[PDB]
Amino acid sequence: TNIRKSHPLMKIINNAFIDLPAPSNISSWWNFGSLLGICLILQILTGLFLAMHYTSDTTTAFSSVTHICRDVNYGWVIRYLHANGASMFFICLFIHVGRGLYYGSYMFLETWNIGVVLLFTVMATAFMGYVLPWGQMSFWGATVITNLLSAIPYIGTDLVEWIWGGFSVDKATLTRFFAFHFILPFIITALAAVHLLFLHETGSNNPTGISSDMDKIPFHPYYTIKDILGALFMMLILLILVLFSPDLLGDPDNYTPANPLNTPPHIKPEWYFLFAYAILRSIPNKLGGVLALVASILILILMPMLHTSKQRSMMFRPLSQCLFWMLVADLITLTWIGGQPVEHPFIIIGQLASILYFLIILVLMPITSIIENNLLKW
Amino acid sequence: RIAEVDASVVREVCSKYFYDQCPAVAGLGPIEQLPDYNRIRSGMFWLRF
Amino acid sequence: AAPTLTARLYSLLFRRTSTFALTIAVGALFFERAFDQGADAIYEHINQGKLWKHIKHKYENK
Amino acid sequence: AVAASSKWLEGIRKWYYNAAGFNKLGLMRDDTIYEDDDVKEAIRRLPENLYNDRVFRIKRALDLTMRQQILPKEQWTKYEEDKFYLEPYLKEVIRERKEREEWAKK
Amino acid sequence: MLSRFLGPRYRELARNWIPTASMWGAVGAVGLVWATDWRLILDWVPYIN
Amino acid sequence: LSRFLGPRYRELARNWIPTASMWGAVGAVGLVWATDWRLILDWVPYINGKF
Amino acid sequence: REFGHLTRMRHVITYSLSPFEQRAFPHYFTKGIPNVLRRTRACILRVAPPFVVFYLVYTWGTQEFEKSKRK
Ligand code: HEM
Ligand code: HEM
Ligand SMILES: Cc1cc(C)c2nc(SCc3c(C)cccc3-n3nnn(C)c3=O)sc2c1
Ligand SMILES: Cc1cc(C)c2nc(SCc3c(C)cccc3-n3nnn(C)c3=O)sc2c1
Secondary structure, three states: OOHHHHOOOHHHHHHHHHOOEEEOOOOHHHHHHHHHHHHHHHHHHHHHHHOOOOOOOOOOHHHHHHHHHHOOOOHHHHHHHHHHHHHHHHHHHHHHHHHHHHOOHHHOHHHHHHHHHHHHHHHHHHHHHOOOOOEOOHHHHHHHHHHHOOOOOOOHHHHHHHHOOOOOOOOOOHHHHHHHHHHHHHHHHHHHHHHHHHHOOOOOOOOOOOOOHHHEEEHHHHOHHHHHHHHHHHHHHHHHHHHHOOOOOOOHHHHOEOOOOOOOOOOOOOHHHHHHHHHHOOOOOOHHHHHHHHOOOHHHHHOOOOOOOOOOOOOOOOHHHHHHHHHHHHHHHHHHHOOOOOOOHHHHHHHHHHHHHHHHHHHHHHHHHHHHHHHOOO | OOOOOOHHHHHHHHHHHOOOOOOOOOOOOOOOOOOOHHHHHHOOOOOOO | OOOOOOOOOOOOOOOOOOHHHHOOOHHHOOOOOOOOOOHHHHHHHHOOOOOHHHHHHHHOOO | OOOOOOOHHHHHHHHHHHHOOOHHHOOOHHHHOOOOHHHHHHHOOOOHHHHHHHHHHHHHHHHHHHOOOOOOHHHOOOHHHOOOOOHHHHHHHHHHHHHHHHHHHO | OOHHHOOOOOOOOOOOOOOOOOOOOOOHHHHHHHHOOOOOOOOOOOOOO | OOOOOOOOOOHHHHOOOOOOHHHHHHHHHHHHHHOOOOOOHHHOOOOOOOO | OOHHHOOOOOOOOOOOOOHHHOOOOOOOOOOHHHHHHHHHHHHHHHHHHHHHHHHHHHHHHOOOOOOOOOO
16 A cells, blocks of 8 residues: 555654645745754754753853863864854744734734744743853843842742852852753744644645635645755855854853953843843833833734734735834844943934834734725725 | 567566656546646656666 | 767666665765865965965974 | 715725735735635635636636736736625625624623 | 465566665675775775875 | 623623632632742741741 | 645646756746846835835934034
8 A cells, every 4th residue: 555644653744744735835934934943953952062061150161161162172163053053043033923924824823822932932041041151241141130030029039049049149050040041942842843733724824815725735845845945055154154253243242251340341132132122221110121021022912813904914915014114124223222332312212112113013003904994995 | 479578578668668757647527636747757766776 | 960968877877766866875986086176275275375284394304 | 975085085095906916916806805704604605606716816816926927917907897796795794693692692 | 484485486576676686785885985984995996095 | 892792791700700719819829839939938827838 | 634625626727747848947037137127126115115214313323422422
């Protein structure tokens, strides 16, 4: 018989990747889901190499990272793969979310709500790992979060003297930062399997928004070859960064060891946390700052019930497309402001762009879709 | 002309006409499960030999 | 109707379907014989008199 | 419902029709609607000849989009010849759902 | 018990597959000679040293 | 909207606020057992769990 | 959701050609250039004007931080 259809293991592989019906007009914006799965496997294997030579102790944390870049064989290529592979993960993740928002993919309700959970868990993972080298941004990044995490009204100060081991920063301090950072990427993997199990119930959306059961093609060979090609083009760009500019995206101030007594001239996080940092510093309060930071990721879960248009995607809606790229050009503004010092021009621009991020999603988008319905007579 | 045919003759003439060639296909009726032309064309060779 | 030299290997070996999958192994030879006269020799030519093994003679012997 | 400036608003409706581009793929307005459970009941109530016309227009537009091409301009759907074929079937399906809902609370 | 492999025309099937199977024993003689760089048969041919 | 408003929606909420405060008060007293919530540990002093 | 159970369709015919019967590049730079000039002309006025607003705010913003200093 056909062993692809009767063997107990080969049946599951055949239904998921070989004979799966897929739309025929899928773009290369639909490439970034398997790119995210490549970036996750890469961070796991490279991170399991660094964890055999790292030491979690605030007297020898900075010195165990310089040792692998100088002494251990191929330690310099594997360390800068890990730091630059994390920037690769966050750029594919922002393309992925912006795709599902422009083409209306949030209508797959169980698939969209597992995705908002996955977005929190990778942001918390990347925060813990940047504490571990323990230079002067791992220090002044850790304290800015955990004095902002003492402004939780009834259990706040209970939770700040738990993560340092009980204390201020000592040898047992970065054992808890390290153990969280070890474990969370393996929960991200389990949530991404459930993520695809709910998408297998409907199949994919397509750029028109219109259902396409009359036009399916098999997944092999048409999207097995198109996904291999996009993965090779991504491994090219990543190695251009590791081998020709490995310090382009980082900051020089993290090559000085952590010193409570010395002073850093500025406080600048990584580029993919700079938009959230600009929303924090626009709220003169410390309870209303941590609220507006958590409400800027949690507003994604209101997108299914804010939808008032008759059509699913933005391909045929020209006024909704002017508002979509006003929102992208507003997250670029908040990334620039987050890396500037706090003086006069960058203080009013920063809070007038925190208002515009919530005014577009909550007010201007649902009103614009109703005007479009009325100009088409529904 | 029939008595000359044996198994090595049959094995030779079939490889000349069938193996690794492009077929022509026609279909009519409830044919949604008729396989794609790429999947039909790959069935014209075996990866062993 | 004189054709061009496409069918060097369509008949003999790349038809049986085996050297098609075996030229990752059989066909893995003599290009680390060849593309070393590329990258290595282009590298020492752009950087002439700047590497260690260029200048190590005058520190050598005794 | 203005009577003197409904010539101004007839021009804005024509401008929006051309700026949206389902006519360049040879589609009608009711081809592009989002199919919820309400719209899926109006589709299966259509007569056989109108259902078959809709399946071919969608398949042809999905094929043009795979190739990044559009139709020749002589085959674009005109604004006055777009037939709202699905709208009377959809109003009846919605009117029956409101009646099962007012019955359940009273 | 394994005289299921013992037929008058079942050993005819070894005669038409061993010309394909005469060769991939010489892929191991050429493929990890590539891979693990064995100095035994780099002594063999004057192409490579 | 009015798809959820009616005399039948909060009908079964008035039947379920007893099944609600029991949704909430159990989880509220479930939150002290887990993380040794020490400012509500001796809310009633009969639990001297910490030695 | 497998192939012979997806939808119902009547009266449509498909003609296709083998991949070994075809040229790899029939037209590459004689339709590839005017077709991307059509697709660029359709997108530009929806995508570009928000990024011309980030430029005029970056240029004014990094010009009131310089003149705050040295009179
Ligand atoms: C580690 C994180 C993630 C992984 C590995 C992942 C993986 C995938 C894959 C492989 C697909 C199918 C192919 C594709 O359409 O690209 C997909 C689709 C999808 N994902 Fe993700 N994803 C992740 C995070 C997210 C997030 C953060 C969101 C949204 C908040 C999300 C929402 C969706 C949606 C809505 C789809 C279906 C889109 C469509 O078919 O149009 N995912 N994902
Ligand atoms: C989604 C997955 C991951 C992300 C986004 C991530 C991110 C990071 C980042 C940003 C750093 C800081 C590196 C620097 O800038 O110098 C780091 C460090 C580190 N990570 Fe990861 N990581 C991931 C997975 C893992 C895993 C699974 C492990 C271990 C099993 C791991 C082990 C380490 C170690 C040991 C360090 C030590 C400090 C250093 O090498 O610089 N990581 N990680
Ligand atoms: C190279 C390569 C290999 C593999 C094995 C692979 N696997 C996927 S996940 C397939 C999938 C599932 C399992 C369920 C629902 C929808 C989709 N799906 N449908 N369309 N697209 C673009 C999808 O990813 S990508 C990819 C790329
Ligand atoms: C959901 C979530 C969670 C967390 C915890 C979080 N945190 C930030 S900002 C942290 C930071 C500061 C304030 C200063 C210097 C460096 C870093 N920093 N720490 N790690 N990385 C990669 C950094 O850039 S946004 C965000 C979002």
